[PDB]
Amino acid sequence: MPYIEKLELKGFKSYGNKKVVIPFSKGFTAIVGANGSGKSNIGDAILFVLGGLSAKAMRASRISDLIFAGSKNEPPAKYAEVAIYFNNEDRGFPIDEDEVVIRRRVYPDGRSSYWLNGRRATRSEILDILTAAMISPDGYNIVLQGDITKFIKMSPLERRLLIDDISGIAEYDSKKEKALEELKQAEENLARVDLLIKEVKDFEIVERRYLELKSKREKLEAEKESIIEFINEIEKEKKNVFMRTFEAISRNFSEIFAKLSPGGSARLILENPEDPFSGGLEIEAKPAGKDVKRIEAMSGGEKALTALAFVFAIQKFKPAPFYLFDEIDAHLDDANVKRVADLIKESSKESQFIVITLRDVMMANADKIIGVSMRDGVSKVVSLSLEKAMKILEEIRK
Amino acid sequence: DIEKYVEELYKVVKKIYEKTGTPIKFWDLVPDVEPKIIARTFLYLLFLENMGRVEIIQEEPFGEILVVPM
């Protein structure tokens, strides 16, 4: 799967007029620093370059407030710019390049421009390429500030649509639409032949025409019947693929939640198991020694562990190219943060993980750590490899 | 809670700098060969740098890191 090699920021929020390059581990990167350092702006930068339209979602009041406003030693920027570099050696992107670069600029007048590997592109073209690579602009794998609350307040219908997507049943809806088109034409042709037969009811002429119409009708009726069977089959297969997906993720979710919350347990619930597509997807969890609660009623740490168990339940079934977390630890003590970080580190063999944090227990598990600090109203970064650090210090222990 | 450990590390940085006058290698500041302690030392320095009490110097990405008090 593709992964993020680096992110380049220029004139974006607290990042000044000199381009700042943020490199990433293929596995687990932690983005760390003081609150107020600009470390969280890196999350907003990724939402931005992947096409985010909502200033609030990028922690700004208007889109133009994403533009660096100047500092002690710097003038304001003419525009905000972010470029993201994906490794594409396995062609997760339908582009014949070992590297896919997406670049976005926004200007004080509020307009945005996009580039795909140096060539201009519309936002729609960018989203199409990200969809083809199964990279979401703001999907379930991106959990920034406020997104755990959003997942808690999410409707059961929206929650099921997430599983619909992961399961891949959209190909079945497509096949069904094409079969309904064929059925439509069959019915139109049947009604046409039926009108022509009614009118028909010189002997040789009328008998010839009646026999040819009766034969065309017989072919149309068989064609109609086989399309209806095909539609029935498609509907069964769609339900089957979805249920296989749901049951595996449901199992994952229960296991993971029991691991994050020792002595606890939880279940995914289909509001209509008989016809899943007529209802939502609900969540109930029972923390150790507490009553069964339903996810919308959950608070604090239980709420965050539940949302995280759901994310990892999906990533264990179908891993996304990357996951981007910020504020997921705000209501977790060190013991709980340890369990999440171990889960992240174990999953980071199959997906890229970027975690913005100042919790050292989360930090400890990372392959690389990007430290962010604000110098004179301008954010700057320092990069550290933990493997390299471990080796260098073990050798100094002599 | 943590403020005293960050301040302790600052005083260490300042005392060593008053004796050598030269930038201090990050590696020489890390008290244990354990990933959490490497991470915590790095973090405490980033806290100090965000407050303007030290400057962290790195020429190349993932290159040697040096510390100078301000």
Author numbering:
A (entry chain A): 1 to 201, 973 to 1169
B (entry chain C): 143 to 212
Text taken from the publication that reported this structure:
Multi-subunit SMC complexes control chromosome superstructure and promote chromosome disjunction, conceivably by actively translocating along DNA double helices. SMC subunits comprise an ABC ATPase “head” and a “hinge” dimerization domain connected by a 49 nm coiled-coil “arm. The heads undergo ATP-dependent engagement and disengagement to drive SMC action on the chromosome. Here, we elucidate the architecture of prokaryotic Smc dimers by high-throughput cysteine cross-linking and crystallography.
We noticed that all residues on the Smc head domain, which were cross-linked by BMOE when substituted for cysteine, map to a relatively small surface area.
